[PDB]
Amino acid sequence: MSVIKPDMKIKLRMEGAVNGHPFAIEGVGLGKPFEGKQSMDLKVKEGGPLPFAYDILTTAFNRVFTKYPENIVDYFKQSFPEGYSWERSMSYEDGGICIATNDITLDGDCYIYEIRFDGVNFPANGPVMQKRTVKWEPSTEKLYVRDGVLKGDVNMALSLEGGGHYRCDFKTTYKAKKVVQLPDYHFVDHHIEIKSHDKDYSNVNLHEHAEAHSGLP
Amino acid sequence: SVIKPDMKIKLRMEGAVNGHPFAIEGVGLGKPFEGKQSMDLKVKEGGPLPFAYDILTTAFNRVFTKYPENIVDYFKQSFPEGYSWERSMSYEDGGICIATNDITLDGDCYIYEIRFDGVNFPANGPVMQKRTVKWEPSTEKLYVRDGVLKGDVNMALSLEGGGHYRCDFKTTYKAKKVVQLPDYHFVDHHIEIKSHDKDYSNVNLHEHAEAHSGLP
Amino acid sequence: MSVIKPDMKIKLRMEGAVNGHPFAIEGVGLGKPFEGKQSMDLKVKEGGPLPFAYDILTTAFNRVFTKYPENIVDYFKQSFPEGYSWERSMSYEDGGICIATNDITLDGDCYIYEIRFDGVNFPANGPVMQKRTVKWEPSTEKLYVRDGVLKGDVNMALSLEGGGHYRCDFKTTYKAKKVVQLPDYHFVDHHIEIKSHDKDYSNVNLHEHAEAHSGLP
Amino acid sequence: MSVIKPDMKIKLRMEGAVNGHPFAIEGVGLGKPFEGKQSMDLKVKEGGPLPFAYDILTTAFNRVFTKYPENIVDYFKQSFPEGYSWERSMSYEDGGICIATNDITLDGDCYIYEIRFDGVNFPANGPVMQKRTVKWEPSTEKLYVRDGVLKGDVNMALSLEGGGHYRCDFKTTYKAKKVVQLPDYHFVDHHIEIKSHDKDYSNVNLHEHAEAHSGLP
Ligand SMILES: [K+]
Ligand SMILES: [K+]
Ligand SMILES: [K+]
Ligand SMILES: [K+]
């Protein structure tokens, strides 16, 4: 009581490949774990310029930054100081598919992410290889316990240039590194936004706002 | 001027699950602007039903959804001509249902013609074993595609003995006339069986639904 | 044991709906069970002229007509005279999805099918509603036992007018009406063909050739 | 002169992660490309003993070793000496999902593979993490052209210890590194087998036999 301060820092490195093309990105940021807000700056270190839509990475760049109510177990805050990991599949409607992992540790006031990201089967003319995405719409993730860990599923949509949406289904498994208390079925509303970026996206400023709830009464 | 603050509902569903035919009729009423509704359902054929009644309930109308001013209400616009929907329901254990509803309006009463079909439910699964408790509340994601409205929702049935059984809904809503097309939005749901008899020949069913646009 | 002839007959009625549009079709045919060949003539009785590619229905119009090698168990011929039923989902790459059931009985030398077929979510501009399909490619179905019944999965593809293919995944459950010996994992090669039809498909002549095998040695 | 001999060699390195646990494997082998047979020895170099069923990896360890008839275009042999790459998703019935990539080059008479393999969401209690798999059944892959490259889809099944099967759907994209003749829709029968292995699977002898065909008749 309590290793989680109302303001905390973040450092990350992501190593990855999309359609066989390796890349690496590093980031530093800060957030307010209790208001469920956070932001960070990201730099492409390898594989620049990135030949695919930068949006497909942004949800990989931590649910501790989630405003939780008193009446809902917070699975992620409990997990610390030791931390937790997640595994995620991201299945796009045109047969594109990404899978990512994050190992999350804590070093004093700073969370440290080790991220692996991989994607394949994106069509050369699809909205990802042509960089035709605008942003992720807001979302509501559904979280439920299975086999003693936490699952989260969310229907995601990328707004497209020239209108319409491009759909993706996320399936995440969250794994506390130690015994914590398990939440009941609940929801997390999200909104992730790229607030600014250069032309090749080599530098990105990224924000997220997330709040948990129990849905309709 | 066809949508009165209090409306009635009449429906018939004809269907089959794992090749077993059945039919259900229902009467109900709701408050379209409050996004609340309820109804009484009676199994007319194929009773007693050999499968979890819960797979049928979401088939038994987004007219009954509370829409804000700032969000276009596709469903209230479609009347008096009305609209139809098509829906696939994909269960994590390979069970799959598809349903259709053709919705018309007669005076103050909505009329549903529903077809429901399901296959490949495992005999030892929670559907055929009837081990479901209720649907969790949900948030549906609605977006336009090819001039019509799509709605996708991550659904989950609570199970006897704990845990959940997941289902992915994909719905297409089709107005039977030209209507204004909404921006990407959400509909929170909560559907509940309030009462039923032992073998579910009689069911009282409630839904509460509200539209919104997510996190500012 | 002997309730099957080297030549047998078929009668069927299918009732169905695609995208909410009801229809009905009847058919009569004959086949050579032990050779795995059959053909039939089909007539639209209701809902004509069908507004969707007829091809989506054709596999719905009996594995009794499969040549089975002596060394593979034949679940299908073995089930008669009590017969069997099947349930099938057919998932198309564009979100279109059909499910169908067949209850198969035997009356003397004639199999009788009671078929229900339903499909939804076919896009208005897609190859099914726009009737742009040419034929099913031949296929190899994979059959395996689960929970004391027989499963069959097959990767299907419709050739398209002006090139390319439109993919569909079939998952079938076959259920004998009496206890039968269960087969080992095996394959059925298929080739289904519309040999002739009239302009709007009110009348169709349909052939299938099917042989079981156990793959590369 | 043809860069493809009747007998050729193979060298590979795979780097990967399953459920967030990294590993690396190297292999050397040889095969007869015009006969569609090949074999190789594999050694775990990092991450061993592998904590998951080795079986999930084996298909990631080259369609060149496929016997093509003369009447079917051979996308793979044509692609050399410049070679080709593939991307593959492998979707398991219990929500486990792997994606892999292979970049294939040619050095003299030795193919060189650079392989990335990633898998997530395999349940702790599943047959992959519990190592309850026996072998892959033989299979028939379906190959078709799309967007000027070659697609291959295959229904796979792992035989399980003490009965039954565990199903996986493969979707592969093959990309020649230069312009080659595109084939028409066809099939490849496969049979992959671990012929021998030591106890924790640090050392594996792996064989594959593959033949192309056009289906019935
Ligand atoms: K863009
Ligand atoms: K129950
Ligand atoms: K056509
Ligand atoms: K084993």
Automatic annotation (TrEMBL), chain B:
UniProt keywords, alphabetically: Chromophore, Luminescence, Metal-binding, Photoprotein
Phenylalanine amide, modified sites: 60
Binding-site list for Cu(2+) 1: 196
Organism: Echinophyllia sp. SC22
GO biological process terms on file: bioluminescence; generation of precursor metabolites and energy
Binding site for Cu(2+) 2: 206, 208
Pfam families assigned: GFP
Classification via InterPro entries: GFP, GFP-related, Green_fluorescent_prot
Name of the molecule in the record: Fluorescent protein Dronpa
Domain of life where this protein originates: Eukaryota
GO molecular function, one term: identical protein binding
SUPFAM superfamilies for this protein: GFP-like
Family: Belongs to the GFP family.
